[PDB]
A paper describes a structure:
The spike protein of the SARS-CoV-2 binds to human angiotensin-converting enzyme 2 (ACE2) through the receptor-binding domain (RBD) and changes the conformation to fuse the viral and cell membranes, mediating viral entry. Here, we used a structure-guided strategy to engineer an inhibitor peptide with mutation-tolerant and potent binding ability against all SARS-CoV-2 variants. We named the peptide CeSPIACE (COVID-19 eliminative Short-Peptide Inhibiting ACE2 binding). For engineering, we determined approximately 2 Å-resolution crystal structures of CeSPIACE or its intermediate-stage peptides complexed with the RBDs of several strains, including WT, Alpha, Delta, BA.2, BA.5, or XBB.1.5.
The binding interface of the RBD with CeSPIACE is largely shared with that to ACE2, so mutations resulting in immune evasion outside the ACE2-binding site do not affect the affinity to CeSPIACE. First, the main-chain structure of the ACE2-binding site is invariant to form the backbone of the binding site, though amino acid substitutions alter the side chain. Superimposition of the crystal structures confirmed that the RBD main chain of the binding interface was perfectly aligned, and the main-chain structures on RBD surfaces were invariant among various mutants. L3, Q7, E23, L26, and Y33 of CeSPIACE recognize the main-chain structure of RBD around A475-G476, N487, Y501-G502, Y495, and G416-N417, respectively, fitting into the groove between side chains. CeSPIACE was designed to interact with Y473, A475, N487, and Y489 via L3, L6, Q7, Y10, and M36; with R498 via G20; and with Y501 and G502 via G22, E23, and L26. M13 and V14 form a neutral and optimally sized pocket to accommodate both Q493 and cationic R493, which exist among Omicron subvariants. Mutation mapping on the structure showed that most mutations of the Omicron subvariants were outside the CeSPIACE-binding site, but R403K, F456L, N460K, F486S/V/I/P, and R493Q were on the binding site. FSEC analyses showed that CeSPIACE can also potently bind to these binding-site mutations. The F486 mutations tended to reduce the ACE2 affinity but did not affect the CeSPIACE affinity because CeSPIACE recognizes the RBD main chain through L3 and Q7 whereas ACE2 primarily interacts with the F486 side chain.
Author numbering:
A (entry chain A): 1 to 39
B (entry chain B): 334 to 530
The structure:
Amino acid sequence: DKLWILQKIYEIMVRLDEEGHGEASLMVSDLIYEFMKRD
Amino acid sequence: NLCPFHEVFNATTFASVYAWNRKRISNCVADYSVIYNFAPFSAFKCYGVSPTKLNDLCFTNVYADSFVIRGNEVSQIAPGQTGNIADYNYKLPDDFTGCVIAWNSNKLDSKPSGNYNYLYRLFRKSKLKPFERDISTEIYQAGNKPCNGVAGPNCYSPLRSYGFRPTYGVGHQPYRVVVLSFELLHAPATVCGSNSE
Ligand code: NA
């Protein structure tokens, strides 16, 4: 449901950062906010 | 005697937005020009008053809130806004009458391997009230299972670092923000514009 995909997004945001993709990480950050605020 | 704005605007480092700093300004004279020219600003919107009008007015107290956010987040520092910063880090009330001032601080706050010292809150159970400051570190519970203060599945730390680097696009570069609030109590106004009385 909602939560599996939330976990994956979180993990890729984290993974993006540790591989030097800070900016991309920040953009996934934004998606988390958007997704959790929602229905 | 003279209001210490220089020390707000020109501080070496700034606060994280989730742990935003507030400086009380009292008992002093204020030319609000030393500010207007401090730096090249990317934002300078006053709501109640205007700068030139400010040089005539006296207040009881002025409060200078300051922090660092991303360029693209600056627009959240306004009344009636929503988003990650307005919802969970720093919230202005709708009837706000002071000034929001922002500028690019890429040169000061960005670092080659990224600046992890500036933080924001990503996860919150509800929106902040105007001028609330939540410095909690409760692990957040996303699912139906309680976290019991343990980080894990559907259980996340609530804060993230910005990791500012000089080569990011400008929207993802750090901006220093100063929010001035102008307080008028029933009391002697000790903070006066430089062309008053
Ligand atoms: Na924006």
